[PDB]
Amino acid sequence: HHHHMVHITLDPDTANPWLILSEDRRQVRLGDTQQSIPGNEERFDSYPMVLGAQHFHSGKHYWEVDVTGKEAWDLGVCRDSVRRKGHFLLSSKSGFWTIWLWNKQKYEAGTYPQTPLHLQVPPCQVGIFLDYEAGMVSFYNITDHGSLIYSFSECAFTGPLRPFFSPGFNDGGKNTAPLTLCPL
């Protein structure tokens, strides 16, 4: 899957305004306050969420994310069509294919309802693989020899798809650290 590597740039036009993106659009973290930026149609308004600029219409695509020091986060892909504005449940039923950590050490897949995961090694790095034609998205524990964390299959897929990130909420005080997309 390593050879299907893709270079992803976070899109500030989708970014929830509490989010702070590094200049190179390779890092995202949650600010202590809220940016003043357009209320445009792509912007996630309710939750600290951001997409990659990239759209996947076909083919196989792979990337990695550092989560070192983080008590919560959310990673995966979603339909370009997913709703941006207002409250919703993160799941395949809303057109997102994600896993997450919340409340330090509780890992779960975004099934409806959510599936708790039994991991042997807390991941410091997460790999995300998309096979469009096979309607598949899978999550590997880079820290544990690239062991499969979880796989969504028979996803079908018709629209364009988007990479998806949240550095999580900081209700904790201790989730300040950013997500980082690893150079590969």
Ligand SMILES: CNC(=O)[C@H](Cc1ccncc1)NC(=O)[C@@H]1C[C@@H](C2CCCCC2)CN1C(=O)C[C@H](N)c1ccccc1OC
């Ligand atoms: C709390 N309900 C849940 O089961 C999960 C839990 C969850 C936590 C973390 N990662 C994924 C899932 N929440 C959601 O699906 C969404 C996304 C979530 C975000 C995502 C990453 C940034 C920080 C947290 C916060 N969340 C809501 O708050 C929903 C919300 N409560 C709501 C859903 C419907 C109808 C009215 C409604 O509230 C008005």
